[PDB]
Amino acid sequence: SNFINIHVLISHSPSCLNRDDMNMQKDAIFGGKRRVRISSQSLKRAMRKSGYYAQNIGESSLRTIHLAQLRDVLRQKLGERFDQKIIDKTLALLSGKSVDEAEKISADAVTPWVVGEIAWFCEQVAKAEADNLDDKKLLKVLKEDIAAIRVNLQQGVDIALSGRMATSGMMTELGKVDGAMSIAHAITTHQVDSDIDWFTAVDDLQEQGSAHLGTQEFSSGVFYRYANINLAQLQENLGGASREQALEIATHVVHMLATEVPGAKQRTYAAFNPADMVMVNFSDMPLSMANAFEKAVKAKDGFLQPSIQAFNQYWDRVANGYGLNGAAAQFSLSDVDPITAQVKQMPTLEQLKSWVRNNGEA
């Protein structure tokens, strides 16, 4: 199926992984009950800026888009709008190597935002040939733009998976790169009792002494992270692109969701906790399992176990009713298991990632 669904249950020790403009924990009302929230942007930044991301995605083999490979295709997709000479000029200004010189490796498909940007460049060099400013004169005024696209042509997977970088030299409407993974707001499965740390600041030269007072809200809790991956869009933005590679990226996303945590007040509260549960399932449509905790989970022996239980019990009755189909696998650290099979039980996270990498086949 086209969509990959990632569901994570992770418990956090007393901390404050996300603040508002008034130094208070971000929250969200769910089921009429207040839940502590970790914004999706915080999670997605925590992933995108992580070292694992930089290793497996920042330095992927498919990060570099060679324009010389896209010679023919760009000529037939923009042949309706521009002349061939203009296109060749643009590629010669961007690469910047003129010769053709067929690489003996001419691509079949092209990434959309690429044709979107180089089309803009074609327009610019067209009106530049009409004015007419010579190649050097115009290359002087297009320096920032040319460099701007040159750095983007070396970060294919990053843009394809996370989107453009909030300050990429993109202009055209096609330059607005979304996806390919969608990260949801992480909310607590339960109603949270927020604590207020009441601290002071000791002056070593007047320890008598007038104390510098302060407060800071913190709370522990079991969070439910959800994310999804659009494989078709990931293949299109790397176009490319074989499905297996997209799966290989999806594994990285799974791992990052299972491990990465925002760095807010981690120097003083240190909530470096790993995910206690993570399930992956393929589907024709993305679905969050948030309504499993629509009715606020109440603690029997902690919040974690009844959260796992609530999740599984929800998946049992709800899964088949909705269009979930198959296939699904779950990696957890504690029984019970969902009574329903067709959800393979994985002992380790690496086995789960390997399961994802093989398109969910056993």
Element (H, E) at 8: strand 3-15
CA separation for the pair 63, 84 (Å, rounded): 27
Closest distance of CB 143 from other proteins, Å: 10
Asked if 357 is part of the footprint of its own copies (rule: CB under 8 A), the reply reads: no
In the set 1, 95, 182, 325, which binds its own copies (CB under 8 A)?
A: 182
267-271 long-range contacts, CB within 8 A, separation 24+: 269/13, 269/14, 269/15, 269/16, 269/218, 270/13, 270/15, 271/12, 271/13, 271/14, 271/15, 271/17
Site for other proteins in 183-212 (CB under 8 A): 183-185, 187, 191-196, 198
- CB-based contact 279:326 (threshold 8 Å): no
Asked if 322 is part of the footprint of other proteins (rule: CB under 8 A), the reply reads: yes
- CB-based contact 243:231 (threshold 8 Å): yes
Could you give the angle at the alpha carbon of 87 between the alpha carbons of 84 and 90, nearest 5°?
Answer: 150
Asked if 104 is part of the footprint of its own copies (rule: CB under 8 A), the reply reads: no
Of its own copies, other proteins, none, which one does residue 131 interact with (CB within 5 to 8 Å by kind)? none
The DSSP code sequence of 112-124 is HHHHHHHHHHHHH
Shorter beta-carbon distance to its own copies: residue 135 or 326: 326
Binding mask 101-120 for other proteins (x = CB under 8 A): -----------x---x----
- CB-based contact 220:12 (threshold 8 Å): yes
Whether the ω angle into residue 28 lies within 30 degrees of 0, i.e. cis, is no
Of its own copies, other proteins, none, which one does residue 350 interact with (CB within 5 to 8 Å by kind)? its own copies
Alpha carbon separation from 274 to 52, 71, 261, 336, 342 (Å, rounded): 15, 47, 9, 19, 26
Site for its own copies in 75-94 (CB under 8 A): none
CA separation for the pair 32, 191 (Å, rounded): 10
- Which residue, among 257, 276, 262, 314, has the nearest Cα to 5 in the 3D structure? 257
Site for its own copies in 201-260 (CB under 8 A): 201-206, 212-213, 218-220, 226-228, 258-259
- Which residue, among 222, 219, 228, has the nearest Cα to 282 in the 3D structure? 228
Looking at 95-103, 130-138, 145-153, 317-325, which segment touches its own copies (CB under 8 A)?
A: 317-325
Of its own copies, other proteins, none, which one does residue 167 interact with (CB within 5 to 8 Å by kind)? other proteins
Half-sphere exposure of 205 (CA within 13 A, CB side): 0
Looking at 27-35, 119-127, 167-175, 237-245, which segment touches its own copies (CB under 8 A)?
A: 27-35
- CB-based contact 254:353 (threshold 8 Å): yes
Asked if 129 is part of the footprint of other proteins (rule: CB under 8 A), the reply reads: no
Looking at 28-36, 126-134, 136-144, 150-158, which segment touches its own copies (CB under 8 A)?
A: 28-36
Closest distance of CB 229 from other proteins, Å: 9
Asked if 348 is part of the footprint of its own copies (rule: CB under 8 A), the reply reads: yes
Binding mask 31-60 for its own copies (x = CB under 8 A): xxx---x-xxx---x-----x---------
Asked if 340 is part of the footprint of its own copies (rule: CB under 8 A), the reply reads: no
Shorter beta-carbon distance to its own copies: residue 128 or 356: 356
Whose tokens are 């869009």? That residue is 233
Of its own copies, other proteins, none, which one does residue 148 interact with (CB within 5 to 8 Å by kind)? other proteins
Sign of CA dihedral 286, 290, 343, 244: positive
Site for its own copies in 283-312 (CB under 8 A): 284-288, 290-291, 294-296, 299, 301-305
In the set 8, 56, 87, 163, which binds its own copies (CB under 8 A)?
A: 163
Alpha carbon separation from 189 to 24, 74, 245 (Å, rounded): 19, 50, 34
Residues of this chain that bind other proteins (CB under 8 A)? 2-3, 20-22, 24, 26-32, 34, 39-41, 112, 116, 144-145, 147-148, 165-167, 169, 171-174, 176, 178-179, 182-185, 187, 191-196, 198, 215, 217, 226, 228, 230, 232-233, 284-291, 294-295, 322-323
